[PDB]
Design a protein around this ligand. Structure first.
Ligand code: CLA
Ligand code: CLA
Ligand code: CLA
Ligand code: CLA
Ligand code: CLA
Ligand code: CLA
Ligand SMILES: CC1=C(C#C/C(C)=C/C=C/C(C)=C/C=C/C=C(C)/C=C/C=C(\C)C#CC2=C(C)C[C@@H](O)CC2(C)C)C(C)(C)C[C@H](O)C1
Ligand SMILES: CC1=C(C#C/C(C)=C/C=C/C(C)=C/C=C/C=C(C)/C=C/C=C(\C)C#CC2=C(C)C[C@@H](O)CC2(C)C)C(C)(C)C[C@H](O)C1
Ligand SMILES: CC1=C(C#C/C(C)=C/C=C/C(C)=C/C=C/C=C(C)/C=C/C=C(\C)C#CC2=C(C)C[C@@H](O)CC2(C)C)C(C)(C)C[C@H](O)C1
Ligand SMILES: CC1=C(C#C/C(C)=C/C=C/C(C)=C/C=C/C=C(C)/C=C/C=C(C)/C=C/C2=C(C)CCCC2(C)C)C(C)(C)C[C@H](O)C1
Ligand SMILES: CC1=C(C#C/C(C)=C/C=C/C(C)=C/C=C/C=C(C)/C=C/C=C(C)/C=C/C2=C(C)CCCC2(C)C)C(C)(C)C[C@H](O)C1
Ligand SMILES: CC1=CCCC(C)(C)[C@H]1/C=C/C(C)=C/C=C/C(C)=C/C=C/C=C(C)/C=C/C=C(C)/C=C/C1=C(C)CCCC1(C)C
Lengths: 80, 151, 174, 138, 95, 33, 162, 216
């Protein structure tokens, strides 16, 4: 599966979670930013690797990062 | 009066029920083919399929091969058909080796023993059909000239 | 279970034995592919046309109508057709038989719905078949003579193709 | 819990539906409730009419289900949709929304997975972690 | 009980459509023409005469310049058009 | 050419039997679990 | 591989012994038929205009395969087709070439199996090992002396064949 | 379980002793070559047809030596065993000649054989419980006679014997050119060989000169 990391530069804008087509990311409680929330990736086995979350991230260099790894049926987006 | 319906009454499967796919003529022809006909061992399915395919394999090799203008054109064409048959039998064997787990079930094509039986039948049928085509073309001048002997 | 005509074959499913001349003879299973009533109407039309052709071949060997020998000369059987295509007799026959066969097509539509027996045109002006037993005997005789006539017309026309004589002249000058 | 007896939208069928891997590896299901019968676009290609009431639909991929969910959310204001994973054995795994609350909203009990406690520029060099099972994050 | 699809029983009406389309195409094409392709006959009759002429010369196929190919193509084109339109009209309207 | 039979013996073997057996055994090796 | 009866197995020893016994027979019969001139037109050089480019040998004279060599190869082609069909579609009673994965290997016979005369597997294995050794010895005696293999057989059998 | 004909070999698994003429003789296990139930029946039917055809061959090969039908020698000459097939076919065909004897035989026998094909297909699948080789042809009622319980054994035995016999007589004609009765009475047949035309498979007699002795 692909690996998705969220670094502590996250401002909790929830844009990466809204951009995710595969429901990989979610918002959890945090105290490191003014929004009081940070992104997390509990479901990276469903990650296709499209990097729409990285496109959605507004922080100078990204807070959410996708590292493409081992390809599975889900990560390759195969309907067969 | 609609001629195209969802396949197997399932609108979300990736198929459509069409006159080419699901008519009575198509269903009868498909259910009566040796690959699908009921009551056949996989060996006999192989025998019928091999007889047909090996029988027609002689013709293009005989008429269009590099030895087609020689007196040994039919012998060369049959030998080329036999080599193709042996190559295809090796293909069938390696497909069955990598595709199937060793199970007790042997009455179905998609089992290891069933595929081995099908391969054996296909080899014997292909050799027999090619030999029958060789005999008929060797002994009938109509088949040697593809009808030009009548002119 | 087994057929009567061919004892080593299973009886055809579409052959119940109700139609006249049914001895379970369908080794190729044509009644399983085509409709049995369509095949029966075809069999009766081929057989009746063959009965007329056989009787006509024999009678045209026996005698010709007045003035026919002026136009046809010594031509017999098949040889007449071409000549009388030019004179116009075959055109008139084609016209009026086609006109009758339009209503025959409507009758085929009736029999394919199941509302008409095959070959039944209700044509009994002389009331020969007033008894259903005599009707059954006449149906059997009609279908047997129709099939025999199909064989006969085949033999007569191919014997004429070989020798050029005709049926009765070949029977005499063999 | 996925009710298998939920009626499906009226669809004429297509060649874009699920293949043999749906019945062999895994399949996905999406249910939602509509206030009226209305035409939506299938994620596999074609137009279907969702019925008034509950709708159950089967797809090959999770992304197809979530695309359909986004379409019915942004075009028909339908937010009650549920996405499940179904295995050949009959096991149904509820997927979305995982805890009942949508992932873009914070919910109690959620724990952070994959969070790194420094900026992305503080990752280790590959030469530092070569021939060693240390992660590049530190 | 011919099913045209998985669960769609449909009457093909092959006898009526074939007979009616054959008669409705052959009879208008009995109209004669003095052009050398027809030879003084109608399209159907010139086609049948060409069939007889080329069957009198078995093995030997009709040549490229022989009128058989053009007669066959036009006759079967009109016949197929008549059969398609007749199937549409009789199977659909049925009245 | 001395031992002129050797090209006609070895070229069909090396060009058809060797790649066929290699492709078959490599297929079995890469597809087996 | 080894779980199917291929490699250094008793199955492979038996199969190569059978083929070697047949090979000794075929070499003796080849020497007999060639010595008596029973191969028709044995020195006729096959022509490329009839048999194609496969007949080309590129020797110093003729550039074609001799008819005897082609006839010997066709005789081998017959039993090769028999071999392919017996390997893929064996008789129900017959010993198979490749064995199933869960098969029971035949015990190695050691120096010599028990002395069961007749149509026994022990006699088959003994004569098979003997025939393989005989092929080795005949080849070595042919290539260390320059005597042709048919002639080496004819001298080793004391000119009985011809 | 061992064979009755071959007491040391094991009995073939597909033979049940139900069929007449079984003595356990199938060393190649041909009856086990297909797992299907009707296959053995198919085999038996083939055997029956072979024997019957062979019987009609063998008697014919004798009777064609004794007398010929009127006008036959004016058409084909003095050919005896397999050059009749060749000579008729040389004079058969539109354009090639006027006879149609072998083609007429092929036509009517092919009608009978297609009608037989349907029966073999039906008996193979199990839609019919008819015995192999049984066509219901008993117009003279010998099955309702006495001693009819061994007629099938005599049929199969004389069938096999006629198979071997016609193989004999044909391979004798191909070498000597005599025919059955002259071959039987002319015991040293290599001292007086009748000149005969080559068959329609002349390549098969090619090794007789070079490979084989060619005594004749
Ligand atoms: C298609 C067939 C056919 C053909 C070509 C003819 C042709 C002919 N018929 Mg004829 N005819 C036919 C059928 C046919 N008929 C039939 C079915 C009958 C009913 C029995 C007759 C009864 C008939 C009579 C009674 C006479 C002719 C006569 C004639 C000739 C006319 C001579 C004249 O002066 O005027 C003419 C050649 C006349 C003649 O002189 O003939 C020699 C004449 O008198 N025909
Ligand atoms: C080629 C011959 C031909 C043509 C032109 C038509 C035409 C027509 N039929 Mg029809 N029919 C035919 C043969 C034909 N039929 C035969 C053989 C049968 C018997 C099986 C029937 C049985 C039948 C029934 C039972 C009914 C019709 C009806 C109709 C009408 C509307 C339905 C339709 O098909 O519209 C077709 C539309 C057009 C042809 C006009 C569009 C023109 C474009 C350019 C297409 C034409 C293609 C081409 C030029 C045709 C060339 C013909 C070729 C032979 C040269 C229409 C006038 C129905 C109706 O309402 O009429 C009473 C009806 O109830 N037909
Ligand atoms: C170096 C490899 C190699 C070799 C040795 C050959 C050899 C040959 N090719 Mg060629 N070929 C090759 C590569 C090769 N090809 C490639 C890569 C292509 C693709 C572009 C082709 C495409 C090609 C075509 C399209 C044709 C040939 C033909 C021929 C034959 C020449 C004509 C002749 O006399 O045939 C006479 C032929 C025979 C007497 C029949 C021989 C049958 C053999 C002995 C059976 C062998 C069975 C099999 C290999 C068993 C092993 C299976 C196992 C590997 C799984 C000859 C056997 C022609 C031919 O005749 O094909 C038969 C022909 O039509 N070739
Ligand atoms: C296949 C069985 C077989 C047969 C029938 C013969 C038969 C013969 N061999 Mg012979 N031989 C055989 C196997 C056989 N050998 C084997 C396996 C070898 C070892 C490679 C030899 C090595 C051999 C030599 C070295 C000589 C013979 C010689 C002879 C001939 C006379 C001496 C004699 O009786 O041999 C007695 C039996 C043996 C020597 C071995 C058994 C005789 C015809 C002699 C001869 O005159 O040859 C031209 C001779 O000098 N043989
Ligand atoms: C026309 C061929 C023919 C056929 C199809 C059969 C069929 C049958 N015979 Mg039969 N038989 C025949 C001729 C035939 N017979 C003749 C001529 C004789 C007299 C010698 C016999 C004597 C005989 C006996 C004594 C017995 C049978 C039995 C049987 C039945 C068991 C299956 C079997 O053995 O068939 C296999 C035979 C064939 C299919 C004939 C074709 C030959 C095969 C295919 C050759 C294999 C090919 C390959 C090249 C091997 C040849 C070389 C090899 C020997 C090294 C079966 C119904 C048994 C039976 O029914 O018991 C009640 C039995 O005991 N047969
Ligand atoms: C395919 C085999 C065959 C062939 C080629 C012939 C060929 C011939 N037969 Mg013949 N025939 C055959 C089978 C065959 N028959 C059979 C099976 C029988 C039944 C026993 C007869 C009974 C038979 C008789 C009784 C006569 C001929 C006569 C003739 C010759 C015709 C000469 C003549 O005057 O005709 C006139 C005869 C007929 C048209 C039919 C009678 C002709 C060459 C005739 C003959 O020898 O003429 C001198 C003759 O009288 N055949
Ligand atoms: C229904 C209706 C009725 C009507 C009616 C109709 C008019 C009935 C009329 C019927 C006739 C036409 C029946 C004809 C049968 C002909 C066949 C059987 C003979 C075939 C010859 C074969 C054997 C042969 C040939 C042979 C070979 C091949 C070639 C030759 O060398 C030799 C040879 C000749 C021997 C009427 C009007 C009564 C009123 C009634 O109220 C209802
Ligand atoms: C002779 C030759 C062949 C034969 C062969 C056989 C199969 C080849 C001989 C084979 C065996 C496998 C060689 C034995 C090696 C044992 C070692 C080297 C000595 C170890 C101590 C065949 C079958 C192709 C027929 C050919 O017409 C003649
Ligand atoms: C069904 C049944 C019945 C039927 C019936 C009839 C049709 C039965 C027909 C039967 C046939 C004629 C039986 C023929 C057997 C031939 C064999 C035994 C002799 C073979 C040759 C030997 C081996 C030899 C050879 C030899 C060697 C090789 C070479 C030669 O130099 C010498 C020689 C020639 C001696 C009927 C119709 C009555 C009705 C009933 O209701 C139902
Ligand atoms: C002239 C000519 C040409 C031509 C041409 C052309 C253009 C040909 C045109 C042909 C046409 C228009 C044919 C129409 C046929 C209609 C039929 C038979 C309807 C049958 C209806 C039925 C049976 C309905 C039955 C019914 C039934 C059972 C149930 C309900 C009631 C009812 C509806 C009555 C060229 C151009 C090629 C050139 C050539 O050189 C000469
Ligand atoms: C008409 C025609 C032609 C033709 C033709 C024909 C009809 C040719 C030949 C046909 C046939 C059927 C030949 C049969 C040969 C049988 C053999 C050798 C049996 C051996 C049996 C043995 C050894 C039994 C052994 C035994 C067994 C099994 C059991 C134990 C006892 C034992 C004795 C040991 C041509 C080709 C000339 C062409 C021409 O243009 C047209
Ligand atoms: C034309 C037609 C019209 C248009 C539409 C269409 C349907 C697409 C088209 C069909 C095109 C195609 C589909 C036409 C259909 C074609 C196929 C290719 C016909 C194959 C026939 C195989 C038979 C003859 C071999 C039979 C075995 C014999 C008896 C063997 C005996 C052997 C056995 C083993 C035992 C040993 C002896 C020997 C001799 C070795």
């Amino acid at each position: 599966s692909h690996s998705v990391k969220v670094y502590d530069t996250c401002i909790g804008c929830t844009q990466c979670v809204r951009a995710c087509p595969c429901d990989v990311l979610e918002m959890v409680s945090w105290d490191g930013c003014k929004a009081g929330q940070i992104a997390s990736a509990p479901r990276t086995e469903d990650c296709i690797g499209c990097k729409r979350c990285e496109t959605a991230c507004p922080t100078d260099f990204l807070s959410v990062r996708v590292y493409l790894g081992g390809e599975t049926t889900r990560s390759m987006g195969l309907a067969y | 009066s609609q001629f195209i319906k969802p396949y197997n009454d399932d609108p979300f499967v990736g198929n459509l029920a069409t006159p080419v796919s699901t008519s009575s003529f198509t269903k009868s022809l498909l259910s009566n083919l040796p690959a699908y006909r009921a009551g056949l061992s996989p060996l006999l399915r192989g025998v019928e399929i091999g007889l047909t395919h090996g029988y027609f394999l002689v013709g293009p090799f005989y008429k269009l091969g590099p030895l087609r203008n020689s007196d040994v054109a039919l012998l060369s064409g049959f030998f080329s058909a036999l080599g193709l048959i042996i190559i295809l039998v090796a293909c069938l064997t390696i497909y069955g080796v990598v595709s199937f787990e060793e199970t007790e079930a042997k009455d179905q094509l998609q089992t290891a023993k069933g595929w081995r039986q099908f391969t054996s039948g296909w080899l014997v049928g292909s050799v027999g059909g090619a030999s029958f085509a060789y005999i008929l073309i060797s002994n009938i001048p109509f088949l040697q000239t593809a009808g030009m002997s009548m002119l | 279970a087994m057929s009567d005509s061919v004892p080593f074959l299973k009886q055809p499913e579409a052959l119940d034995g109700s139609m006249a001349g049914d001895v379970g003879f369908d080794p190729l299973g044509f009644s399983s592919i085509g409709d049995i009533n369509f095949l029966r109407e075809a069999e009766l039309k081929h057989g009746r046309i063959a009965m007329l052709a056989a009787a006509g071949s024999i009678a045209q060997d026996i005698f010709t109508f007045p003035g026919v020998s002026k136009v046809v000369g010594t031509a017999k059987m098949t040889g007449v057709h071409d000549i009388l295509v030019k004179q116009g007799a075959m055109g008139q026959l084609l016209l009026w038989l086609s006109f009758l066969e339009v209503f025959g097509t409507i009758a085929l539509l009736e029999t394919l719905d199941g509302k008409r027996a095959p070959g039944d045109f209700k044509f009994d002006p002389l009331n020969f078949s007033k008894n259903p037993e005599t009707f059954k005997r006449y149906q059997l005789a009609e279908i047997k003579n129709g099939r025999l006539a199909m064989m006969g017309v085949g033999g007569m026309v191919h014997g004429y193709f070989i020798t050029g004589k005709g049926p009765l002249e070949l029977l005499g000058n063999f | 819990t996925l009710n298998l007896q939920i009626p499906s939208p009226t669809f004429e069928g297509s060649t874009g539906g699920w293949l043999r891997a749906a019945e062999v590896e895994e399949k996905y299901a999406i249910t939602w409730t509509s206030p009226k019968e209305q035409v939506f676009e299938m994620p596999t290609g074609g137009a279907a009419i969702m019925r008034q009431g509950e709708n159950l639909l089967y797809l090959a991929r999770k992304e197809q289900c979530l695309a359909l969910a986004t379409q019915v959310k942004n075009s028909f204001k339908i937010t009650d949709y549920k996405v499940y994973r179904i295995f050949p054995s009959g096991e149904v795994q509820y997927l979305h929304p995982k805890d009942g609350v949508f992932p873009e909203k914070v919910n109690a009990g959620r724990v952070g997975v994959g969070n790194v406690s420094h900026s992305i520029g503080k990752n280790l060099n590959p030469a530092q972690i070569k021939f060693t099972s240390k992660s590049f994050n530190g | 009980k011919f099913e045209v699809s998985d669960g769609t029983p449909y009457d093909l009406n092959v006898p009526l459509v074939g007979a009616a389309s054959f008669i409705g195409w052959v009879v208008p094409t009995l109209l004669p023409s003095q052009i050398p392709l027809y030879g003084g006959k109608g399209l159907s009759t010139a086609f049948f005469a060409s069939i007889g002429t080329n069957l009198a010369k078995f093995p030997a196929p009709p040549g490229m310049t022989d009128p058989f190919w053009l007669l066959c193509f036009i006759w079967h084109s009109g016949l197929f058009a008549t059969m398609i339109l007749g199937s549409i009209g009789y199977n659909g309207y049925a009245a | 050419m001395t031992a002129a039979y050797l090209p006609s013996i070895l070229v069909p073997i090396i060009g058809l039997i060797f790649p066929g057996l290699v492709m078959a055994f490599a297929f079995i090796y890469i597809e087996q679990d | 591989f080894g779980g199917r009866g291929l490699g250094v197995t008793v199955n492979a020893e038996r199969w190569n012994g059978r083929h070697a016994m047949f090979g000794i027979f075929a070499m003796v019969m080849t020497s007999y038929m060639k010595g008596h001139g029973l191969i028709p037109d044995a020195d006729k050089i096959l022509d490329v205009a009839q048999w194609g480019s496969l007949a080309s040998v590129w020797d110093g004279a003729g550039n074609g395969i001799s008819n005897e060599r082609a006839i010997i190869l066709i005789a081998h082609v017959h039993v090769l087709v028999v071999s392919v069909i017996a390997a893929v579609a064996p008789f129900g009673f017959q010993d198979t070439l490749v064995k199933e994965k869960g098969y029971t290997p035949e015990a190695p016979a050691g120096l010599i199996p028990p002395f069961k005369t007749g149509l026994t597997p022990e006699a088959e294995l003994i004569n098979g090992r003997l025939a393989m050794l005989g092929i080795i010895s005949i080849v070595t005696a042919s290539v260390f002396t320059g005597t042709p293999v048919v002639d080496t057989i004819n001298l080793g059998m004391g000119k009985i064949l011809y | 379980a061992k064979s009755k004909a071959i007491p040391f070999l094991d009995a073939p698994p597909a033979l049940s002793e139900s069929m007449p003429g079984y003595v356990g003789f199938d060393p190649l296990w041909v009856s086990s070559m297909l797992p299907d139930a009707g296959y053995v029946k198919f085999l038996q039917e083939a055997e029956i047809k072979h024997g019957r055809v062979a019987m009609l061959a063998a008697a014919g090969a004798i009777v064609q030596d004794i007398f010929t039908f009127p006008g036959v020698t004016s058409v084909i000459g003095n050919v005896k065993m397999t050059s009749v097939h060749d000579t008729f076919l040389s004079m058969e065909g539109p354009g090639k000649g006027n006879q149609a004897a072998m083609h007429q035989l092929l036509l009517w026998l092919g009608i009978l054989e297609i009608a037989t094909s349907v029966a073999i297909i039906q008996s193979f699948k199990g839609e019919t419980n008819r015995a192999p080789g049984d066509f219901g042809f008993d117009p003279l009622g010998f099955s309702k006679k006495a001693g009819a319980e061994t007629m099938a054994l005599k049929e199969i035995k004389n069938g096999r014997l006629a198979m071997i016999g016609i193989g004999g007589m044909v391979h004798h004609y191909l070498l000597t050119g005599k025919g059955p009765l002259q071959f039987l009475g002319g015991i040293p047949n290599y001292k007086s060989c009748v000149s005969h035309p080559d068959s329609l498979l002349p390549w098969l007699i090619k090794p007789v000169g070079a490979v084989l002795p060619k005594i004749c």
